[PDB]
């Protein structure tokens, strides 16, 4: 099962969303310093790194005011989570290219 689909099962169950609603995906590159909380953006780790960004969207996702996201730096997974209704980032996974910082990927086991 793909990461996107694990994320979808997790979010739809957590937020009680329709399972057969289509999730579309927007991919954008942006510097880590403008995406992540400051405490997680540090010289020699994520600072000044361009991330490849996947943000998922649908009508019931917009109604719940959340944005599920997956972040990469080239081939290395950097983050999995969702921006919640307060516009805070909520992580299931976070790696800074040196070590894993947060890892609740067991939540994606389906």
């Amino acid at each position: 099962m793909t990461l996107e689909l694990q994320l979808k099962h997790y979010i739809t169950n957590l937020f009680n969303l329709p399972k057969d609603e289509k999730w579309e995906c927007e991919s954008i590159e942006e510097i880590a310093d403008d995406i992540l909380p400051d405490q997680y953006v540090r010289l020699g780790a994520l600072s000044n790194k361009i991330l490849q960004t996947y943000t998922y969207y649908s009508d019931t996702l917009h109604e719940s005011n959340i944005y599920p996201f997956i972040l990469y730096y080239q081939k290395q997974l950097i983050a999995i989570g969702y921006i919640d209704e307060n516009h805070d980032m909520d992580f299931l996974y976070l790696h800074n290219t040196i070590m894993p910082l947060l890892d609740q990927r067991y939540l994606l086991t389906g």
Binding site: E24, C25, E26, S27, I28, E29, E30, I31, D34, I35, I50, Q52, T53, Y54, T55, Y57, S58, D59, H62, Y67, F69, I83, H87
Partner: protein, 216 residues
Amino acid sequence: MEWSQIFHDITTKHDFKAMHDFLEKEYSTAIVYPDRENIYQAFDLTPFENIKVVILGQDPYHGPNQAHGLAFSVQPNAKFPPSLRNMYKELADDIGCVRQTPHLQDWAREGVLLLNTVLTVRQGEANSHRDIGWETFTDEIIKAVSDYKEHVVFILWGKPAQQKIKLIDTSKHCIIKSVHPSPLSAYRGFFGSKPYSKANTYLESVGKSPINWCES
């Protein structure tokens, strides 16, 4: 000065045969967006002589019935991408008007060149056509706009677009730049940045009429 003349210059200076051979095979064996006949739609809708504002995008949307050859725009019945939703929120706060269509062919008719830096993508695979020659092409397009037009606004959202600053003559042209409108970055300086009225104020300072950004 016409796109056909500029394209001729570009295709003479660089050899794109391997790109076209790669794309021929991609459109035969895979699902590539946008539809082939739409690849140059930004050029078809904004003739060179008409450009007043250049907005740089990255890759085309990579899902079904989304991309149609314009940066940021999706097809009239498609859902709102997160970045476009944010662009329209800033638009409502800056200019005042509310757009409900996600289609930007009207902006393109107004003189907004909606140029992605890469013009094709395989379905579901972000960046899948990075480095096949589009960047060479599209870097040359930005240069050409800078070189041959008198006074254009370049709007550069996100770090990748801002890497094109070195191709733009700022003694001639106006650069407006900020973090990307994606909800991942938008609160770090996209909201409140007023790119639309800033663009129009510059156009008026230089004796050009403003862009009508409202539904037209």
